[PDB]
Protein backbone atom coordinates (compact mmCIF):
# COMPACT_ATOMS: atom_id res chain seq x y z
CA UNK A 1 0.00 0.00 0.00
CA UNK A 2 2.97 2.31 0.61
CA UNK A 3 4.00 4.01 -2.62
CA UNK A 4 7.44 3.70 -4.20
CA UNK A 5 8.46 7.34 -3.75
CA UNK A 6 7.04 7.40 -0.21
CA UNK A 7 8.89 4.17 0.56
CA UNK A 8 12.12 5.70 -0.75
CA UNK A 9 11.55 8.77 1.42
CA UNK A 10 10.82 6.67 4.52
CA UNK A 11 13.98 4.66 3.82
CA UNK A 12 16.14 7.77 3.53
CA UNK A 13 15.20 8.91 7.09
CA UNK A 14 16.39 5.65 8.74
CA UNK A 15 19.74 6.11 10.57
CA UNK A 16 22.62 3.67 9.67
CA UNK A 17 25.28 2.67 12.31
CA UNK A 18 28.23 2.83 9.84
CA UNK A 19 30.78 5.42 11.09
CA UNK A 20 31.14 8.02 8.33
CA UNK A 21 34.88 8.58 8.99
CA UNK A 22 35.87 5.29 7.24
CA UNK A 23 34.10 6.25 4.01
CA UNK A 24 34.32 9.05 1.44
CA UNK A 25 32.11 11.17 -0.78
CA UNK A 26 30.90 9.74 -4.07
CA UNK A 27 32.38 11.77 -6.95
CA UNK A 28 29.80 13.70 -8.98
CA UNK A 29 28.04 11.26 -11.32
CA UNK A 30 29.49 8.20 -9.54
CA UNK A 31 26.22 6.24 -9.96
CA UNK A 32 27.94 2.86 -9.47
CA UNK A 33 29.88 3.47 -6.28
CA UNK A 34 32.57 1.27 -4.81
CA UNK A 35 33.69 -0.23 -1.48
CA UNK A 36 35.25 3.22 -0.74
CA UNK A 37 32.03 5.34 -0.79
CA UNK A 38 28.86 3.16 -0.57
CA UNK A 39 27.03 0.63 1.63
CA UNK A 40 24.17 -1.51 0.11
CA UNK A 41 21.29 -3.06 2.14
CA UNK A 42 18.38 -5.29 0.90
CA UNK A 43 14.78 -5.51 2.21
CA UNK A 44 12.93 -8.51 0.69
CA UNK A 45 9.75 -9.48 2.63
CA UNK A 46 6.46 -11.23 1.60
CA UNK A 47 3.32 -11.62 3.79
CA UNK A 48 1.57 -15.02 3.87
CA UNK A 49 -1.28 -16.46 6.00
CA UNK A 50 0.15 -18.85 8.59
Amino acid sequence: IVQDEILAHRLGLIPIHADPRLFEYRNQGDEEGTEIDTLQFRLQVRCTRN
Partner: protein, 50 residues
Protein backbone atom coordinates in the same frame (compact mmCIF):
# COMPACT_ATOMS: atom_id res chain seq x y z
CA UNK B 1 8.71 0.66 7.47
CA UNK B 2 5.42 -0.63 6.04
CA UNK B 3 2.50 -2.99 6.58
CA UNK B 4 1.56 -5.93 4.38
CA UNK B 5 -1.38 -8.23 3.74
CA UNK B 6 -1.19 -11.79 2.40
CA UNK B 7 0.12 -11.84 -1.15
CA UNK B 8 1.86 -8.46 -0.85
CA UNK B 9 5.62 -8.20 -1.30
CA UNK B 10 8.45 -5.69 -0.96
CA UNK B 11 11.80 -6.15 -2.70
CA UNK B 12 14.42 -3.42 -3.01
CA UNK B 13 18.10 -2.45 -2.77
CA UNK B 14 19.12 0.67 -0.85
CA UNK B 15 22.38 2.57 -1.40
CA UNK B 16 23.79 4.71 1.42
CA UNK B 17 26.18 7.55 0.65
CA UNK B 18 28.03 10.08 2.79
CA UNK B 19 26.83 13.64 3.25
CA UNK B 20 26.26 16.50 5.68
CA UNK B 21 23.02 17.62 7.30
CA UNK B 22 23.26 20.84 5.30
CA UNK B 23 22.18 19.51 1.90
CA UNK B 24 19.50 17.20 3.43
CA UNK B 25 18.33 16.62 7.06
CA UNK B 26 18.52 12.83 6.66
CA UNK B 27 22.30 13.14 6.89
CA UNK B 28 22.17 15.15 10.11
CA UNK B 29 23.69 13.29 13.14
CA UNK B 30 21.95 14.91 16.19
CA UNK B 31 18.33 15.28 17.31
CA UNK B 32 19.16 18.72 18.69
CA UNK B 33 22.44 20.38 19.65
CA UNK B 34 21.17 23.65 21.08
CA UNK B 35 22.67 25.59 24.03
CA UNK B 36 21.30 28.04 26.66
CA UNK B 37 23.05 30.70 28.76
CA UNK B 38 23.24 29.87 32.45
CA UNK B 39 20.43 31.64 34.33
CA UNK B 40 21.21 33.84 37.32
CA UNK B 41 18.77 34.48 40.17
CA UNK B 42 19.40 36.88 43.05
CA UNK B 43 17.23 37.51 46.11
CA UNK B 44 17.57 41.25 46.72
CA UNK B 45 15.65 40.84 49.99
CA UNK B 46 15.16 37.97 52.47
CA UNK B 47 11.82 36.40 51.58
CA UNK B 48 10.09 34.68 54.49
CA UNK B 49 6.77 33.87 56.11
CA UNK B 50 4.67 31.98 53.53
Amino acid sequence: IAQLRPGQEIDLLMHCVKGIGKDHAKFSPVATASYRLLPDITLLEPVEGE
